């Protein structure tokens, strides 16, 4: 049996304020529903999920969490944005789908602090935020999704990005290139071309082919289209080159979103 709780009131919710959603340790957080009003998702900046003071996932703005959910075609409702720790799209290969999905839940056992920090923009009309938690029996943090942010310059022509962090033992579920002039992209590991120079229209067709929604000004490289976690990129301690070849038409700075995965460690990624 799960428990649906109305989280404690968020302290000091005001424009230009730096607030935090301190989660009580002991149980497992499958989903966290954040209700907002008097402020836009884009006005909720620097969203950071911290476990024991360390960064797990990061969102430039709350709007990126809305887009993250939209991509998987999850239920979107105005005035509310959810933190899906449990991945509903997961499919089991040697275990049940339920086990593969729940395996991403935010367990807090052994944790000292679990926080969701963020900054409220100064322009916020009259910010009002509350949270509800869908919890289950306590478990260690274990397998978690770690959304990381990276900024790189794209040229009009061909740009290559090979300096992406490769935490050993971790995996890569997907890579999202946020740019308005990306025509095609190619992904390779150690010379091996896992993703040919696929045109945007072709890449976007495959995405939609798997029930995903194409995000505006974004080139998504989904490594878990089938929902199989074993299809994701395994950051082998032996990989020599993890490269991305981007064919752009504009000269801009792209925001590269990398969805990492791995067993959370107090001294890990």
Site residues, another protein (CB under 8 A) = 1, 11, 22-27, 92, 94-96, 98-100, 102-103, 110-113, 136-139, 142-143, 169, 171, 229-230, 234, 263, 266
Phi, psi values for residue 43, rounded to 5°: -90, -5
Residue 266: CB partners within 8 Å, gap ≥ 6?
52, 54
Phi, psi values for residue 9, rounded to 5°: -60, 140
Is residue 142 part of the contact set for a second copy (CB under 8 A)?
Answer: no
Is residue 70 part of the contact set for a second copy (CB under 8 A)?
Answer: no
Of 95 and 180, which has the nearer Cβ to a second copy? 95
Is residue 96 part of the contact set for a second copy (CB under 8 A)?
Answer: yes
Q: Which stretch binds a second copy (CB under 8 A): 38-46, 60-68, 137-145, 187-195?
A: 187-195
Sign (positive/negative) of CA torsion 93, 99, 104, 109? negative
Is residue 136 part of the contact set for Ca ion (CB under 5 A)?
Answer: no
Residue 31: CB partners within 8 Å, gap ≥ 6?
82, 83, 84, 85, 86, 133, 134
Q: Which stretch binds a second copy (CB under 8 A): 39-47, 60-68, 76-84, 175-183?
A: 76-84
Is residue 141 part of the contact set for a second copy (CB under 8 A)?
Answer: no
Nearest partner of 135 among 154, 110, 108, 112, judged by Cα? 108
CB 109, min distance to a second copy, A:
18
Binders in 11-40 for Ca ion, by CB under 5 A: none
Among the listed residues 36, 143, 170, 269, the single contact to Ca ion using CB under 5 A: 143
DSSP 121-146: -TT-SS-EEEEEEEEES---S-EEEE
């Amino acid at each position: 049996m799960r428990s649906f709780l109305n989280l404690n009131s968020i302290p000091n919710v005001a424009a230009g304020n730096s607030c935090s959603i301190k989660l009580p340790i002991g149980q497992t957080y499958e989903v966290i529903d954040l209700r907002y009003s008097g402020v836009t998702p884009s006005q909720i900046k620097n969203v950071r999920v911290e476990l024991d003071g360390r960064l797990l996932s990061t969102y430039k703005t709350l709007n990126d969490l809305i887009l993250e959910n939209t991509r998987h075609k999850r239920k979107i409702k105005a005035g509310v944005v959810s933190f899906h720790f449990v991945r509903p799209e997961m499919k089991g290969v040697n275990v049940t789908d339920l086990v593969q999905q729940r395996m991403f839940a935010l367990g807090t056992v052994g944790l000292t602090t679990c926080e969701i920090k963020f900054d409220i923009d100064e322009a916020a009309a009259g910010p009002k935020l509350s949270a509800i938690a869908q919890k289950s029996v306590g478990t260690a943090p274990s397998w978690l999704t770690m959304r990381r942010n990276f900024f790189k310059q794209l040229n009009n022509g061909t740009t290559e990005i090979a300096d992406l962090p490769r935490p050993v033992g971790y995996r890569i579920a997907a890579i999202h290139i946020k740019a308005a002039g990306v025509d095609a992209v190619e992904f390779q590991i150690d010379g091996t071309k896992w993703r040919d120079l696929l045109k945007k229209a072709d890449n976007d067709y495959i995405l939609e082919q798997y029930g995903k929604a194409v995000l505006d000004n974004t080139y998504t490289i989904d490594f878990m289209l089938e929902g199989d976690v074993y299809q994701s990129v395994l950051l082998d301690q032996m990989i020599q080159d993890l490269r991305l070849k981007i064919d752009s038409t504009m000269d801009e700075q792209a925001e590269i979103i990398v969805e990492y995965m791995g067993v959370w460690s107090r001294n890990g990624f």
